[PDB]
Write an enzyme that holds these catalytic residues in place. Structure first.
Site, PDB file in Angstrom:
ATOM      1  CB  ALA B 184     -97.570   0.368 -16.328  1.00  0.00           C
ATOM      2  CB  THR B 185     -91.709   1.377 -15.232  1.00  0.00           C
ATOM      3  OG1 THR B 185     -92.137   2.744 -15.167  1.00  0.00           O
ATOM      4  CG2 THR B 185     -90.343   1.311 -15.897  1.00  0.00           C
ATOM      5  N   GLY B 187     -92.918  -4.888 -18.517  1.00  0.00           N
ATOM      6  CA  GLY B 187     -93.242  -5.580 -19.745  1.00  0.00           C
ATOM      7  C   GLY B 187     -94.544  -5.105 -20.360  1.00  0.00           C
ATOM      8  N   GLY B 189     -97.122  -6.679 -21.011  1.00  0.00           N
ATOM      9  CA  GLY B 189     -98.308  -7.182 -20.339  1.00  0.00           C
ATOM     10  C   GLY B 189     -98.757  -6.279 -19.206  1.00  0.00           C
ATOM     11  CB  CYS B 238     -85.796   0.152 -21.778  1.00  0.00           C
ATOM     12  SG  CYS B 238     -85.541   1.863 -21.220  1.00  0.00           S
TER      13      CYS B 238
END
Lengths: 449, 449
Positions: B184-185, B187, B189, B238
């Site tokens: 999961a790259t 936000g 959430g 990031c």
């Protein structure tokens, strides 16, 4: 004491523990394993008679083996501050704590698991909150009590080890969601809850150790090693042997070697069904025989088994889902399957791992290293154990497996690591990465040449 | 095409891909990065004009840097079958696939992230299913299309790379819960959903790279490196720099060095508030200025900024929650904070990581290695970047960080790893562990001496 209070006490203690040096940390970790070693007889007697499963002498050896092998492995490991320098990559490695650890401990190892997780957490300046199994909460809290007594003698910060005595399912769910990292050693229901908590988790998986005996090996030695691991603690160890995949050429020789070393072999179809209908109820293991002796299982099955029998070997109707006996049997019972040649022996074990236990442990007894490496390459396992009891997969003074009580099953068992859980997984490793000027930037031909 | 169909196509292709050798795997991985390198101009133009954020030339360099540095790092790595032998521990290491990978890709790097994850998955004989960000689904699917075109030319098994074009939140939730491992790259959430799926997951975290400039360092060099990383892709990276923590002794020298190298410094309180009330709305970043140019932000703030300005430096009211400008600013804007001495400079960066971005990246510009090591020991970060732009934390030909597009933030960012995501995290490493007979069993004094 609500879970929010336990978390706040753990975060305060961890910030105090973070100021500890590598030496001051190792002092606390050594005493945690020593008190479990020195009180092994008391812990084993309470764990057996509270959980109503296991063998007293086997849990004494478990407390002695786990506590000594873990400290012997982590005593010289660097886990505080800067721990490694790699000038060839212009890198400096720093070890930092992860924070508050939430560890749900099982009913099968209610003493060495709270010890192992606490030793691995404190080794990296982390604090731990233990949530024990309900049927083992008394002996698990007593272990935490004796450990905190030794930490208090050494002036350690209070509440670096906490216990959640008898929590509801919502309380354990509240604990895992609130901690910085999760350890779930237990059933697949507790493990799936860990990886559903929105936090990084380390879990285990259901075991089903398949054992291949190769043609020509010492069948007497293989029989002794397999029987020793199957009857260990009445067969509740996750890595314990579950089957004997023997060559049909020497099948009578392998079985006679098991019978010679205290096994009761059953070939009759109706007599095997008396055991099968007792061990499994609608494909699920009967909880009344988990961790029970051979005579207890023999009486409930209505089959006469001679005294002194160590394990029960049952002829299976086939590999995989052809027989529910090929599932995990948390009791001193082995299923016997004959194979034609070695690739099929790997296939027979492959089908049982697809049935249950994929990603855990396998055992092999062979002098043919080409066969050992072929089995280790194909089988969906995290650990292959060669010419020794499969119960040593959690660390032994005679093998290279990292000592632990938490055996990860990788992606097969829906775990994050396919290895034994150690101090390494409970610390954040960072990098300082300098600017390397001597390095030359590769060109197009130098990149895609 | 439902998610259950994508999973079944991925499991079939993975079992076909598992038969690949180390050489046959490396052939596919090299072509995946090469096609992104050779089509960088087309991908960057589409990604900028579809996501409405970023700089065209910076994404071209991103495609060139990521694709080349990743393959240059993984070309000689052994990831198939037996990969390492450790006779001193009687261990043999075997690399096995984890299965089907589910990768949710972000809007900021919609090209190099589907490439990086696919290269790392196929490197370990895994298959991948990509779920792109809705505002970038066209360019992310076009990258998968060009990659699958090259795989088809090489006779690779079909559907080893799949795409979920425009999935609902329930569809992505169905995909993560069905795959063997999750990436999961994006936000927080999407990351929290990954670690809530009951599956082992690898996530990222919100960045907030704090930059310490030490007393006596080359302020002109530090200014150039910080400006280069802040304005990179209009500041959506990031690991990009977010602050300039400068010594109050040479504060006017550090700011003048930034102004000399194309920065617009703002000291006036009312003028800074014109930017603050534009960048943040109720403590949340304004989505209308994310990845936008300096003049776009200057026009919306109503402040005259000279042409040619690279970044905006704003004097902050204080460290931590004393100013919302100390949060992550996904735009070419830096907050300027003065410090008294070095330990306080570490404390100022510490408070901003507690505000947002703990566990990600920091930058330092210093010739004092005692100060660099003190900063790397205390700060809650996974990567410290020394005397170079912090945007190089994802891998460079001049530093030792592992090339990637997925930067893990450890337990601080609620991730499983505190390092860059590589092929290593997408394979199960098993052990064959032989019976070591030469080893001597330690006695009581030899264990607890």
């Amino acid at each position: 004491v609500s879970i929010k209070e336990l978390i706040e006490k753990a975060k305060v203690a961890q910030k105090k523990l973070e100021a500890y040096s590598q030496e001051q940390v190792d002092v606390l970790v050594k005493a945690l394993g020593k008190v479990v070693y020195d009180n092994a007889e008391m812990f084993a007697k309470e764990a057996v008679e509270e959980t109503e499963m296991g063998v007293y002498e086997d849990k004494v050896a478990k407390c002695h083996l786990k506590s000594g092998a873990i400290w012997n492995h982590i005593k010289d490991k660097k886990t505080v501050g800067i721990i490694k320098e790699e000038p060839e990559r212009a890198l400096v490695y720093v070890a930092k704590p992860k924070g508050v650890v939430a560890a749900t401990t099982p009913i099968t190892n209610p003493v060495v698991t709270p010890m192992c997780n606490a030793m691995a957490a404190i080794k990296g300046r982390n604090t731990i909150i233990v949530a024990p199994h309900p049927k083992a909460k008394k002996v698990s809290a007593h272990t935490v009590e004796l450990m905190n007594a030794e930490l208090k003698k050494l002036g350690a910060p209070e509440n670096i080890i906490q216990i959640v005595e008898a929590p509801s399912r919502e309380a354990a769910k509240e604990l895992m969601e609130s901690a910085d990292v999760v350890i779930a050693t237990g059933g697949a229901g507790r493990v799936k809850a860990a990886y559903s908590s929105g936090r990084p988790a380390y879990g285990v998986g259901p075991g089903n150790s398949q054992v291949i005996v190769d043609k020509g090996y010492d069948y007497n030695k293989a029989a002794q090693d397999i029987i020793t691991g199957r009857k260990y603690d009445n067969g509740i160890i996750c890595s314990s042997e579950q089957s004997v995949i023997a060559p049909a050429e020497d099948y009578d020789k392998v079985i006679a070697a098991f019978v010679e070393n205290g096994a009761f072999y059953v070939e009759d179809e109706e007599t095997v069904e008396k055991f099968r209908s007792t061990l499994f109820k609608d494909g699920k293991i009967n909880s009344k025989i988990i961790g029970k002796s051979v005579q207890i299982i023999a009486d409930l099955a209505g089959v006469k088994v001679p005294e002194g029998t160590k394990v029960i070997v049952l002829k299976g109707k086939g590999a995989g889902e052809k027989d529910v006996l090929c599932k995990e049997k948390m009791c001193p019972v082995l299923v016997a399957l004959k194979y034609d040649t070695f690739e099929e022996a790997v296939e027979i074990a492959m089908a049982n791992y697809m049935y249950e236990g994929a990603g855990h442990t396998a055992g092999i007894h062979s002098d043919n290293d080409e066969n050992i490496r072929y089995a280790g390459t194909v089988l969906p396992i995290s650990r292959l154990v060669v010419n020794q009891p499969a119960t040593t997969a959690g660390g032994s003074f005679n093998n290279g497996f990292n000592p632990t009580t938490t055996l990860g099953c990788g992606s097969w068992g829906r775990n994050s690591i396919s290895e034994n859980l150690t101090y390494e997984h409970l610390i954040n490793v960072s990098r300082i990465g300098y600017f390397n000027k001597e390095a030359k930037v590769p060109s197009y031909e130098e990149i895609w040449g």
